[PDB]
Structures are given as structure tokens and as C-alpha cells.
Amino acid sequence: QHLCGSHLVEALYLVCGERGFFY
Amino acid sequence: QHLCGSHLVEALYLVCGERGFFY
Amino acid sequence: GIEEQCCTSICSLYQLENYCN
Amino acid sequence: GIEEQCCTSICSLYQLENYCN
Amino acid sequence: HLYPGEVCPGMDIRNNLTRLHELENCSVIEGHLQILLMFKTRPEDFRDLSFPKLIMITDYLLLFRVYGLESLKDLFPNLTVIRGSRLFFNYALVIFEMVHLKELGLYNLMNITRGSVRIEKNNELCYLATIDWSRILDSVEDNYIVLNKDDNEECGDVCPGTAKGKTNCPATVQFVERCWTHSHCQKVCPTICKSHGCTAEGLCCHKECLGNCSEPDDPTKCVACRNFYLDGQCVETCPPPYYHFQDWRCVNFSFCQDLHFKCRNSRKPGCHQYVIHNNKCIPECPSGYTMNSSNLMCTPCLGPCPKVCQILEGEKTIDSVTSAQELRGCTVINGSLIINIRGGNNLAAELEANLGLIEEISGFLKIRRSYALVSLSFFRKLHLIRGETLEIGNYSFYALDNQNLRQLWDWSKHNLTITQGKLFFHYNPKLCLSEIHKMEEVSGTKGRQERNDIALKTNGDQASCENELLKFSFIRTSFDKILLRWEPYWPPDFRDLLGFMLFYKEAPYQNVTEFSWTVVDIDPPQRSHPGWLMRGLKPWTQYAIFVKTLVTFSDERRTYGAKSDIIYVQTDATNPSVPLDPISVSNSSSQIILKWKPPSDPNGNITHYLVYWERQAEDSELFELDYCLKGLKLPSRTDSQILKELEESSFRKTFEDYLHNHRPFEKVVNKESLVISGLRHFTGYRIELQACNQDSPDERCSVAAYVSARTMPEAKADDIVGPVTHEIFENNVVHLMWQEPKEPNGLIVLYEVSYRRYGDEELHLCVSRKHFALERGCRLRGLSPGNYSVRVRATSLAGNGSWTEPTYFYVTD
Amino acid sequence: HLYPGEVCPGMDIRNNLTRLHELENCSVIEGHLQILLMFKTRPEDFRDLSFPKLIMITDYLLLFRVYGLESLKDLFPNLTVIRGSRLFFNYALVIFEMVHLKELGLYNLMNITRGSVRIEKNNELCYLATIDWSRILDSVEDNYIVLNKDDNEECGDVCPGTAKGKTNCPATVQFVERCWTHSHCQKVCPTICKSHGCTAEGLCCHKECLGNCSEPDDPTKCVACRNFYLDGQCVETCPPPYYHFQDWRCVNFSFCQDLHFKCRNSRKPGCHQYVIHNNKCIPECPSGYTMNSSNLMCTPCLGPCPKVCQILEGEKTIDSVTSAQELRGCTVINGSLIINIRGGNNLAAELEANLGLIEEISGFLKIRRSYALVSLSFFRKLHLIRGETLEIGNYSFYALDNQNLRQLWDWSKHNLTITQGKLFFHYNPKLCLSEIHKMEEVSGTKGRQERNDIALKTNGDQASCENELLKFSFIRTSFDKILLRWEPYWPPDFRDLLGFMLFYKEAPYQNVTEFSWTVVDIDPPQRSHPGWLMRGLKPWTQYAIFVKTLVTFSDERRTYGAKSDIIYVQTDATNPSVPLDPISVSNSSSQIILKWKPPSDPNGNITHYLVYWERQAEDSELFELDYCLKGLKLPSRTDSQILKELEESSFRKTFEDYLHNHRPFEKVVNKESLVISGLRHFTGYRIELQACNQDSPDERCSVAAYVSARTMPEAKADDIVGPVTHEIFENNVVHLMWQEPKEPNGLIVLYEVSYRRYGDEELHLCVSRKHFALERGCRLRGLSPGNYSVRVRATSLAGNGSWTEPTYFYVTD
């Protein structure tokens, strides 16, 4: 469903992480 | 459904009648 | 037979045409 | 934007790949 | 003045103290105030935290799980009025699971206009029994104060005055003291002023104040506005050119217009496009009104006026009824729709109610894996797909995996246009290419489709869109069966015909439009008109019948086949059923009322009820039997439960299925109640009742329903008529002669004679019909001589009659 | 002898007198006897109609709507015993709507072995109250005698003896006479013999008789047999070589064998293939038994032994569950099946229960317009279709218009053979040609199919039978979300890929075979591994996920695509929810019991509960306040309903969704009840309770659930210790010294002193803590001189203490 807030940042942490994200 | 007895003879009378049936 | 074909099972109209003059 | 794409509506994984180094 | 600070909207402060300082200046909150989920907070943090300028709250105040908070006496010292315009579940003040909170502390809270207060699960909260909610809340019956520290008595709620004699503020209803904290007690205004507020001296405030004021009787020296706020003064109503706003203040047209301007584009979620109507900056024009862009006034609209609805990123999924309820009444949609209805109960009509008003779609219309949709007719008013927002591949219409979709729209009666984009139909088994090509012609999208955009081998498959026609030839019926025939249709290759299919159902109304249907499969004729013979139909019923062929998709050009038109055939009428529940009641000597209900199986229309009544003579044994013999009778005529219920009902149903194949009478017409006339008093009558649906042309109808009743007997029909003659011969042998009651109630069973000498006792003796006929009365014997008395009573079936006048006789000594 | 006539089976005589004469000779009816629907009959027809030889009826007797019949005294004068082996809806004698019937007349009916009597709607029937059902029926509580002419008293039921003193036969229970007709009265046997019957003289019959007999004490002179009948003699049991038959007579093996022989073929409806078992000619071998053709004995069978079931003309339609219930347990079917299931609830498993035992089909197997059937796995044991009976076109398997059919039989685990005929698959959208060809290979029907028998363009269409495989590449999860990736699959033409499709569901058990599924559509990668990110998953849950491609049927050879295997992925664990319903109860001065229930959201497995208890000191105001001042309080510590229910539940749910993101303690392991030790008496204790699912590796778990309780106070903790010292100075100033109860229940709020002069009255006085501390006790003044008494009681939070032993003091005069 919808993702913004803690959910969005943890979703970015889940998708990436081997190389890192900025947001 | 099932037809034998009065139902069968009236069904034969329904299908035919212009020429007649014997049974 | 006739009754052995229409209440023992379901008989089509073509089978009823076989029992007419 | 990012939050305007993932909680306003449903964002696919390809759109999340666009927000990574 | 009257509000030194600014005004803030609502906020949801959570998890940190870094947001409570937003109330540094504003004195009025235009919304709610929630302080909740404070886990890391310590009591030392609230020692130097205060908002003395806060006075007014519009919606409500909520507190939930704030650790370290002890009292609100420092948080909101001047919180005066909570309007409760919008309540949190019918509550204007919720304090829930406030651990470490000892007392409320809102000593300046005089009034809570709307709602109630819910305080619960506060194991440290004291000073709850010493608060006067009746003086704050107009109705306190909706409160909820349980599970606190005051439930089980453990709080030492002591407030100033107790050591001095509970002074410094009065008490009321037990007459327990009303007070907020250990150093601040509640200020209660006298009843001389209802809610206008009063100063500490005692003099009342102005009518436009609320709770407190600095100067008595001054609208500009209040602390809260009872009706509306303006230029530092409380007013009864907003004067022009100012409009009511949020039911608590007056603002000019400029402010409402500017707020609407920011809400147009520069605020994505949840803003209100404020409009002016009835001199009120209402968030949205009410029903039956439209917005005029010149001055934002809610000018009335004639008929259905547009209701433009925006969508989250212009893409909304509708997978059930609940998602469709949101878009109710939306004439124009500024977005795109996703239809993914996998099932539902009573759809395409309620769904039509929700979505039948859309006339425009700004983006694209999408139907994806919609299992339950059989047709798109619920889009009753859809006429134009803008095609501004498009999916990948530039698709405006995207139909995919629609298993039960049979038609898009009735193109003979519907119009549709698509400005941009191309259609997409894949995996639509029950929808053939004819409908897709017709929509391409209608919407003008013929020149936009390219290769593989339209699936030519996954759509028009199991679809029933026969192009030819089948004509019924021989149709003449009976009361139980219907015979059907039709022209023998042969495809160009006679091997291609798998047979015929016949569909029928009970259709009382002719509003049948295909898409319950009992299906019969029929072998092809042996190269002789093919047909079927229906067998189990109810009499006098309208049946909707149509015949559809069953052909095979050839490797060459597909043979569509032929389907007949939907025809309506009515079965013949037959004999009706027994008229259920016949009841007969006698209310007069010649009038008996007969009541009945229509039969469960009319098998037609009941033209007239046929009633037969026949007189029943009395029993033969009543004439030649003595009823005073030793031993006699007076003929006085006038899951356990479910298992029995189903067995008894089946027992009744078993017999109900078994019956299916010159006396005074009359024909009752269109009436179910009847009264008979010219009846003999107290006579058992046999009533034979029949329902009937044909009178003149060789009438045939139901079997008799039998019931019996006996008329009321006359009160004086059994009275003895004529003199009571007495006779003796020599030896005191009494010979009593008396005439019979020639017209009794049924018959006279016996007579009794009571005789008593002057001053002596009475002895009883019977007279039987055989004795009466042979003796012409009675012959008394074996009694003392002297003057006696004779009294005669006649006994009939109804009962004992009236004793005759006493007659005396003196015998020879 | 003992049965002069023959034996007749049951009959249903109706609508004419031309069939009642069939009882001209037979004395026993082996079945029921129904005489009903007699509309044209006249009373003159029954004057010369009688069956005096009829004695015995096995099942029941029924009469319904026989016009003209007045009494059965002439119909069945010698009807003696109705066994009631088979009852008509738990009734052995039904007389329903017997119009014109005046009295029963069955004066020879002594016994009705089984069932009850239902007599109803008989507006002319008399002589019903004068019948003794207790002497005929073993239990009369099941009778039903209503709506007759005897309901409303209108019958002159007079039977012989009344004119002579109710003689010629006795009366019993009121002691009303028991009798059948106006000239025949009931014969009641003495209680010395229960039901063996007795002669008119009075001597009892033989034990083997029933009701009546010609010679007392003679098994060969009875009229009915209590147990069994043989060679004109009533026997207790059938001796060899005769077997019990119909529970009323004994017959040899020859008769049962011959009856079975006629039942084999020369009887189409209603015959029973009678078999011999337990020396009884039982109609059919019971469960767990089989018939040995040598001697027809029910020889026991090991395991599931065959149960051959015949079908009406060998063609049965199964359109619902009820039709399937008939064929339960039929291992072999001697016919053909028609499956036309258009819907149902919880099918393919209960349907498997009904139809999972069929191993053989003699004719053909047909599946026609079966909307609900998704697979034929419910034919769990089907292995051979004989194909001796075939439809037009010689078809053994006939699948047509199966919209939801996806899989016939798991050919990797199933075997099937078809001896004759050819298959037929048309309009099976969700079933592709691979399954049909596999069945053709398995059943050996490959060489029998010809052109158009198999449809190559209406079957394998919307079918999901991808041949290739998709391999997941990157999978790592979280407590709420799961990330998925898979190898990018590309068909030979990359334009043919419409995208991917992802299915997932909550699967606690790994028994998922995809035969309910949340579907997600995924765009193809831009020629970068495609994948999806799950978002709404519950923590600590097992999800079954597989990925299926979505390709387009090309005009060239069809590209089937690839589908991934069904994989099971488990979400991570997170902090648990609040442990619901915490309750604390104190039962001792140091023991308090703590009870709680597991949280509604464990979010894993609850390894251990974490409990914190902290001592709460008493309130500060309790130390410096006088509690005997005027005005005081004792600190004695210890659709309307639906709308509220939904609002309150939503209110509770609203807060439940908000919370999602050095003191003595202990870890409770696998227990939900706890008792604390080493607690001070009568002290309020703050208990902080937490559920937790991890202890050693960086423990993270739920938020605290708070509850408070106070320990039970000691009975004698408030007692006054030490002597009550008294002192005066000069002017009768009492100076009372006494030691405090150093360890009270919480604290000592105040002391009271009661003093009374010898013979005088007592006056009360308080001592406050500030007064007690300043004065080291109490200082009495202003009282008369003389000898007094002193009594001291200590008051604590628990309550008033025990008064000390009185002490006397005498002051100077």
C-alpha cells in the first residue's frame, strides 16, 4: 500500500543497502 | 423430467395430434 | 418400449416422434 | 519527489531504484 | 485584543518535545490538539513547559500515553472553551492511559460546548470526583470516567479551604466540594446567568462572553466568544462584509478566497476548497449547489450540476463496493479509474448506483481481472475518456483477464469518445471481436491501434454473439408442458453443428434482457424440425425462452451461428388447489359466517368461489333411546422442535402432492367471506366449499374443501306450550298431559317432572320419548294423596329449557 | 392353516374400485395398504365390499379422501395386527380427510406393534373417545387425533350394553367404556397376559399368538405370530433350513434365492437383491460385507470391498451436492455419469467425500457446463472407463463449456484407461492442450480421435500452464515488508511480454498447490532484475509466493512463458503488543498475585514476560493534615446497542493502532500468572508489565502495561504498644504518654482518647500527628477531678485499631 515516513525510509533501506541511498 | 402414466400420454398428445399417435 | 424410455430416463423429442403414426 | 510518489499512490520497485546511489 | 496570540491549526505532536513549542504564540487552535506517544519524556521536561496564552480549542483535546506528565495545571493554565465542532468519537476531551498524571489541572476550563469527556485507565489520576461536569457540560449523560485511580478509593483529593472549613469556593451536588487541583479550585458562576460567565467579584459578564471576563458587561473584555469573534469583540452574528468561518470567527471574503486559492493546487492532501454561502465560508457547497468562479458563491444549479472529484495521483482502484462508495455522485472524475472487482453480492445495480453518474474521466479507464463484472452498463452516463493520463504503452482503455465480461456498452443506445491513447483487450473470453470493433468505430480509435495492441485470438472465444437468427415454428402448450420447435439452422459446413441449447426461466415480467437460466442441450436434427418438450412447468406461468446454437470454431473463418429472440410463453391454466383454512362460525339462528383464504395454487385467476351447504339430520339413535337410564350421557351439541416441524411439514406436503389430478349453492365472486341465510335454528350444516377459475365455458376447477357448523339455538324454542293438564282415575294415579315444543332445538331428548305436596318435599321423575309417545305424557304413581304441584321442563340438545308455571292438583282421599 | 389365504405385496389403490378386488384371496399384506383419492365412489359401492380373510399388515394402513366410505367394519373385519415394520412418517395407521367416514370399525385390531396412529380432519368420524389405544399401542404418547367430529362434542357414541347397564364388555381408564362400533365393542384381555391374546371365554392364548386365537395355549391355533410364522404355526425363531424373512415369517433358501433371481434382471424398479445373512433373507448385505455368488451369503470382505451401484438407464446427472449424496461409497458404477455442477459451497472436498470411491464407470463420463469445478481430483479412485454405453458420436469423455476447469488429473500420480470411444473437449478456456494430450497418451485413446472431435482453438486459451521456470534471485525481508527479485525471462520475441504477475497469501502451512490469492501486476524490466516490494504483511507470518508471467498468444507458435515455483517466505519478528487484561489481586501482607493474557499481536513467539514492581510511598499530605477538623474525610485505602458497540470497538481499535512504533524485576518464562514476594504490608505497589520475545541478543520488545495493587494489611500492625502513661502538674491537666505503633499499615493518621470518670460519662478527643509530635502524645484539660479511665485506639489507613487496655488515674483534689 502507501509508504511515506518511517515506512518509506525502511523500504529504501530494504531495496538498497549494498550500495546505499540518499533520499 | 420423468414422464410415464397420464403425463406420458398427455405429452404424446402434445407433441402429435395433427396426425395421431397409437401407443 | 415407451415408458421404459421417458420416466426411467429423459427422452428427447426425436424419440417421442418415433411413437406417432 | 519521493513521498509524493509512494504514499500519494502505489510506486513500483523500478521507481524505488531511481532513489538510490 | 481579546486574543493576544495568533491562531494555529490542529497538530499531532508525537514522540518528541520538539513540536510542543509550536504553541509558543497562538492563542486559538483551529482544530484538535493531540499529545500522545511520549515514551522518552521525563517529568523534569514539563517543569518549565507552559502555554499561558492558549485559550480556545475548536475540535477537541486528546492525550494518550504521555510518560512523565503529572498535571496540566502548567500545560494549559488558560484553556477556557472547547467548542467540540468536530469530536473524537463523540468525545471532546479524551485522556486515555495517561500514566503518571495525578490531577487534571485545567482550572480555567469553564465550558465544553459539544461532546462529552472520556477519561479512562488513569491509575494515578486524582481529583476526578471533586469536579462539576454539570456546570461545564450541558449534558453529562454521555461521559465516561472509569478505571482511574478514583474508582478504587486511594486518592487524597484535598483542595484549599478544608483546613479552614472548605471555604474559598462553594460546594453543590452530596454537597461535595468542587475543585480542580490542590491549590486551585473550580470557579462556579451563579445560576442568575446560565453560561455568560462571571467575574470573581460576582457580577455577570456580557451575554457574548463565555466563562470568564476581565470587565463585567463588556463584549470587548471577554475571554471567549459565545457565537463569533471579530476585531477583538464578541458579536452575536457576523456583520457584512464579513462571513462566518469555522462557526467561531468572522472573516472577510479576501481570507476565504485566499485559502481557496492555496487549496486549488499548492496543497495536495485533504485541503478544503472553501466557498462562500449563506454568508459562511463553508468548506464545500452543499448538495444542489455549484461554485461560480467569479465570486466563489454557491449559486444554485438546475438539475444534476457537476461534482468534480479528484483522485490520489489520479489513479484509484475499485476492488469492492466500499471503494465505489467514495465516488458516489462524481459527475466528472479528474483522474483515472482501476476496476479490479473479483466478486460481490448484487452488483452492477448497486455499483450502478455508486458509479452511474460519471460523465467524464480525465485519465484512462482500466478494467483488470474483474471476475464478477458481466457488463459495463453500470457506467450509465460515461461519454468521454479524456486520455490525458496514460499508462505504459499509451493506453486509455485497458481490459485484461475479464473472465465474465460479455459486453462493454449497448452501442445502439450509447455514445463514447476517447481523445488520446489506444485500446487494449487481452484474455476476455466471453467478449468477441464484434464489440471491440464497434467500440473502435464509435470512439474514433480505429486509426490508433497497432500490432498486438488488440488480441485477435484470446478475446472472441467462448463468446455468445451469434449474428444470424432462429425463428420458432411450432409453439402450442398445455397446463404443465410446453412444446417448442424452430427452423433447422445449418452452418455452411453441416459437420460444424454440435447441437442446440435451450434456455428458460420463470419470468413474470417481460423485462428480460439475457444477462437462473435452466439450460437444455438438444441434439441436431437427423438431416424434421428440431425442438424440445418442457416437462416440469407450473400452470399459468410466464416463461421466457430463447434458443442458442452451439457451433465449433473452424480453422477457417469462424461460423458465429444463430440465436433466437427472447420469446415469452404462458402455460395453460388447470384446476386450482384446495382453498386453505376454511372456518365457519355461527352467530345467529339462521346466519353462519364462512371465512376462507385463497388456495396456495390458484393455477390461474380465481374467478369465483363455489359454496355448497347441505342440512344434516340428527342422529337416528337420539329418537329411540332413554337418556335417564342408569348410565347415561347428555347429547349437548355445540433441534427437537425442528425435527417435528420438518417431519410434520413433510407429512403435510406429502398429502398436498397427492391431490393434483340438488342442493342450495351459490357463486361467491371476488370475496373470501360469506354468510348463509334462511337456516333452521340449531341444525348441523355440512358446508362443501370449492375455489373455481371458470364458470360458463365447461367449468373445471378444484376439489371440495369440507367444513361443518351448527347454527345458534333459540332461547325460547324449547319452552313448554299449552296447559299442563292433570288427571286421576281412582287410586292417586296422576296422568299429566302437556303439549310438546313442536319446534325444538334439534329434538327433545327427554322430559322431567318435579312434584311436591303442599309443605312436603319434591321428587324427580323423567319422561322418555318412547314413554312420552306411548303414554301421551307421563303417568305418576306411588305417591301420597293431597294437594301437590307440577312443574315441567323440556330438555333439548342445546340444554335444559325453562320450567313451566307450577300447576296444582288435589286427589280424592 | 393359520393363514388360509395367500400373501400379497403392498399396493397403492387409487381413483377406482377396479383394484380393491386384488385382496380377494390373500390374508397377509407384505407391505403397506393405501386406499386414497376416491372421488367418484358412492356409499352403495361399499355395501357389498368386504375382505374377511385379511388378517395381517406389515407396514401400515393409510386412507385419504375416500368419498362414500362410512366405516371399515365391513372393509377389514378381521384385520388383527399391524406390525409397522416401515412407518408412514412414524405413523402405522393414517386416516386423513376421510370424509363421510363415521366410525373406525376395525374391531379385530388388537395390536399395533410399531409406530403410532394419526387421525385428523375427520368431520364425520365418531367412536374415537371410546377406544383404548393403551391396550393396542405400547406407547400412545406419539398419537395424533385432532380436528375430528369428536373434538367438538357432536357424536352420540353409544355401543351395546348402555341400555342394559354398559355391559357385554368392561371399561377402564375416567372409567369410560371402550368399544369400536355401535354393534361391536373392544375385546380387552386381562393383565395376567401382556399381549399373548385371550379367547372370549377368558383363558389366555399361547405365548406365540398375538391378540386372538381359536384354541387357548396352542401355537397352531393362533391368528397372528408374535415373532415368526412357519408351516401354519407361530414359532419363537426360524429353525434351519429356514431363514427369517421380513421379520414376520420364515422361508427357505430357495425362496430368497428365487426372489433375488427375479430381482437381477426381470425387474427394473424397486426390487431388492435379497441376500442371506445371520439366517435372515436381508434385502442387502450390511456395511463391511460382500455377496458370494455361490450361496448369496454375506461373506465378510477385507478392506473396501466393491459396492456396485446401478443407475436409471445408466445416465445420472449430478448438478449439486444432493445428487452426489446418492452415489456415496459406490466403488463401481454400472452406468454413466453427467456432471453439471453450476455452483456450490465448499466443493471438490465434500464432493470428493461423496464421489471419491468410484473406481469404475461402465458407460461414459460426462462433464457439461460445470461452472464451479476447478479440477477433477475429487475422482480420487477413478481408473477405468469401460465405454460400453456411448453417446451420439461414440464419446466416452465429453467435456463441454467448462469455464473454470484447469486440471483433469495429476498424470504424474494418476492412471486412467478408456476401452472404447473418443474424447471431446470444447469450450474449456482455462485448460490447455497439454493436459488433453497427456490424457490421450495415458488412456491409450490417441489413435481414436478424428477431425473436429478435439477443439484446437477453444481449449488451451486463458490457461496458466507455463512450461519454463522462473528462478527467484534476491530475497531479503523485514518485519513488515518483503523484497523479491527473479531472473529476467524473455520470450523469443521480446515484444510478446505484457509483464509479470505476482501471487501471495498467508500460508501458515506449506500445503499450498495453487488450486485466496492477492495478485500484483508488474511491468517488464526496461531491457536490472524485475521484482516487487510487499508492503502490508504482518510480522512473523509465512507467505506463499510464486511469480507467473503474462505473455500474448502470437499468431505463430504459442509462447507458453515461465512460472516460478511456489516458495514460502517468512516475515521477520518485531516488538509484541501490550499484554492484554492485566489483573493484580492481593491475598497476603507480602503476596500479590499478578494475572495476564498473551498479547493480541505476539509478532513472534513470546519467550518471556518482563515484570517490574516499584514501591509507591504514601501521599505527602497525609503527614501534616489534621483529620479531625470540622469537615474531614477518612483515607481508607483498599440497533442502539450495536451503534455503541461498534463505536466503542472502533474507539478501542483507534488507540490500538496508534501504538505500533534500579528496581526489582524478574523474567517470567512460559507463564501468565505471577506472585510477588517480600512486600511490605499495606503498601501501594506500582507494577509495570511487559511481554518480550528476545532476552540475550540485544533484546527489543513491547511497551509497558501498567497496573497497581496494594498488599493486605496486618490485623495487629496498628495495635498500641507500651504502657499508657499518665501525668498531671497541678490543675487536673492530664498528660498522656504512649508509644506509637512503629510499623503501621501505611501510616497513623490520628489517635483518639476516650476518658470517663468512675460512674460518669465518656468524652471523645482526637490527637493529630502535628499535635502528637509537638505534645509527645496528648494533653487533656478542662475536666472534673477524680478517678478516671483512659483507652487509646490507633487509626491507620486500613481502619481503626484495637483499643488498648483501660488505664486509670486519680488527680489531686
Q: Does F535 touch chain A (CB under 8 A)?
A: yes
Report the chain C residue with the minimal C-alpha distance to residue B1.
C10
Characterize the bridge pairing of strands E280-282 and E298-300: unpaired
Give the 3-state secondary structure of residue E290: strand
CB contact under 8 A, B10 and E533: no
Contact predicate E131/E145, CB 8 Å: no
F769 neighbors F628 (Cβ within 8 angstroms): no
Contact E123 F708 (CB under 8 A): yes
Rounded Cα–Cα distance for residues E676 and F665 (Å): 95
Structural contact between residues B4 and C6, judged by C-beta atoms closer than 8 angstroms: yes
- CB C14 to CB E533 under 8 A? no
Collapsed DSSP state (helix, strand, coil) of residue F769: helix
Distance from the Cα of residue F149 to its chain's centroid: 44
Residues with Cβ within 8 Å of E701's Cβ and at least 6 positions away in sequence, in order, are E575, E576, E610, E690, E691, E692, E693, E694
Q: Resolution in angstroms for this experimental structure?
A: 3.4
Resolved by: cryo-EM
Nearest to E533 among B2, B6, B11 (CB): B11
Q: Which helix (H) or strand (E) holds F322?
A: helix F321-326
- The 3-class SS string of F685-723 reads EEEEEEEECCCCCCCCCCCCEEEEEECCCCCCCCCCCCC
Q: Are E307 and E334 in contact (CB under 8 A)?
A: no
How far apart, in Å, are the Cα atoms of E737 and each of E720, E778, F150? Answer: 12, 7, 38
Alpha-carbon distance of C6 to E542, in angstroms, equals 25
CA distances from F43 to E121, F17, F100, F304 (A): 88, 12, 9, 59
Do E268 and D8 make contact, defined as CB atoms within 8 angstroms? Answer: yes
Residues 6+ apart with CB under 8 A from E191: none
Distances (CA, A) of F126 to F69, F122, F145, F683: 14, 9, 12, 87
The DSSP call for residue F5 is S
Closest CA to E355 of E376, E335, E334, E386: E376
Subunits with 3+ Cβ pairs within 8 Å of E are B, C, D, F
* Cα diameter, chain B: 25
Per the structure block, which three cell numbers stand in for E51? 502555554
- Which residues share a beta bridge with E357? none
Residues of C with CB under 8 A from a CB of E: 12-14, 16
Tell whether F532 is within 8 A of chain D (Cβ): yes
Residues of F in contact with A2 (CB under 8 A): 535
Query: Cβ separation of B21 and C20 shorter than 8 Å?
Result: yes
- For residue D10, the chain F residue with the least C-alpha distance is F535
Q: Which chain E residues are within 8 Å of B16, Cβ to Cβ?
A: none
Q: Are E275 and E298 in contact (CB under 8 A)?
A: yes
C-alpha cell at E417: 469518445
Name the residue type at position E421: G
CA F534 to chain centre: 39
What is the spatial distance between Cα B7 and Cα B13, in angstroms, rounded to a whole number?
Answer: 10
Identify each DSSP E strand in F293-433 by its residue range. 298-300, 308-318, 332-339, 360-361, 365-368, 384-385, 395-400, 417-418, 422-426
Residue whose entry in the numeric block shows the C-alpha cell 510506486: D11
3-class state of residue F193 by DSSP: coil
Q: The C-alpha cell of E197 is what?
A: 460567565
Q: Which three cell numbers stand for residue F246?
A: 421380513
**DSSP letter, residue E393:** T
Rg (C-alpha) for chain B, rounded Å, is 9
Q: How far apart are CA E318 and CA F750, in angstroms?
A: 72
Say whether the peptide bond before residue F241 is cis (omega within 30 degrees of 0).
Answer: yes
Contacts of D13 in chain F (CB under 8 A): 483, 522, 530-533
Task: For residue C10, give the chain E residue with the closest CA.
Answer: E535
Evaluate the omega torsion of the peptide bond into residue E241 and state whether it is cis, within 30 degrees of 0: yes
Q: Which residue of chain C comes nearest to E529, CA vs CA?
A: C14
Q: Which residues of chain E from 733 to 792 reach within 8 Å of chain F, CB to CB?
A: none
Per residue, what are the HEC states of F111-140?
Answer: EECCCEEEEEEECCCCCCCCCCCCCCECCC
Name every chain E residue with its beta carbon within 8 A of the beta carbon of D10.
315
**CB distance C17 to B15 below 8 Å:** yes
The two most distant CA atoms of chain E are separated, in Å, by 142
Q: How far is D6 from chain E (nearest CA, A)?
A: 10
Write the CB contacts of F649 (distance below 8 Å, at least 6 apart in sequence): none
Helix/strand/coil (H/E/C) assignment for every residue in F580-627:
CCCEEEECCCCCEEEECCCCCCCCCCCCEEEEEEEECCCCHHHCCCCC
Are F105 and F248 a contacting pair, CB within 8 Å? no
Q: Give how far C2 is from chain B: nearest CA, Å.
A: 8
Are 3 or more Cβ–Cβ pairs between C and F shorter than 8 Å? yes
DSSP strand pairing (F116-122 vs F144-148)? parallel
* Amino acid in position F221: K
From CA F624, how far away is CA E109, in angstroms rounded? 30
CA-based nearest distance B22→chain C, Å: 6
B–C: how many Cβ contacts below 8 A? 45
Amino acid at F174: Q
Residues of F in contact with D9 (CB under 8 A): none
E438 and E416 in contact (C-beta within 8 Å)?
no
Chain D residues whose C-beta sits inside 8 Å of any chain A C-beta: 2-3, 6-11, 13, 16-17, 19-21
In the three-class reduction of DSSP (H, G, I as helix; E, B as strand; rest coil), residue F771 is classed as: helix
CA distance D10 to chain A (A): 6
- Collapsing DSSP to helix, strand or coil, F66 comes out as strand
What is d(CA F642, CA F416) in angstroms, rounded to the nearest whole number? 57
For the record, the C-alpha cell of E695 comes out as 364458470
Q: Nearest CA to E505 among E572, E600, E569? A: E569
Q: Which residues of C touch E533 (CB under 8 A)?
A: 13, 16
**Long-range contacts made by residues F338-341, C-beta under 8 angstroms, separation at least 24?**
F338/F366, F338/F368, F339/F365, F339/F366, F339/F367, F339/F368, F339/F370, F339/F373, F340/F368, F340/F369, F340/F370, F341/F370, F341/F371, F341/F372, F341/F373
CB atoms within 10 A of CB E725: 14
For E646, phi then psi, to 5°, come to -70, -40
Question: What dihedral angle (degrees, nearest 10) is formed by the CA atoms of E341, E346, E348, E354?
Answer: -80
Query: Is the Cβ of E315 closer than 8 Å to some Cβ of chain D?
Result: yes
The Cα F318–Cα F367 span in angstroms is: 9
Q: Which parts of F757-806 are beta strand (E)?
A: 762-768, 778-780, 787-796
What letter would DSSP give residue E644? H
- Of E535, E530, E525, E559, residue with least CA distance to E547: E530
Q: How far F531 CA lies from chain D's nearest CA (Å)?
A: 7
* Other CB atoms within 10 Å distance of the CB of residue F399: 26
CA-based nearest residue to F61, from F29, F38, F37, F39: F29
Parallel, antiparallel or unpaired: strands F249-252 and F275-277: unpaired
Query: Residue E259, CB half-sphere, CA atoms under 13 Å: how many?
Result: 18
Q: Which of E776, E756, E780 is nearest to E766 (CA)?
A: E780
Phi, psi of F605 (to 5 degrees): -105, 130
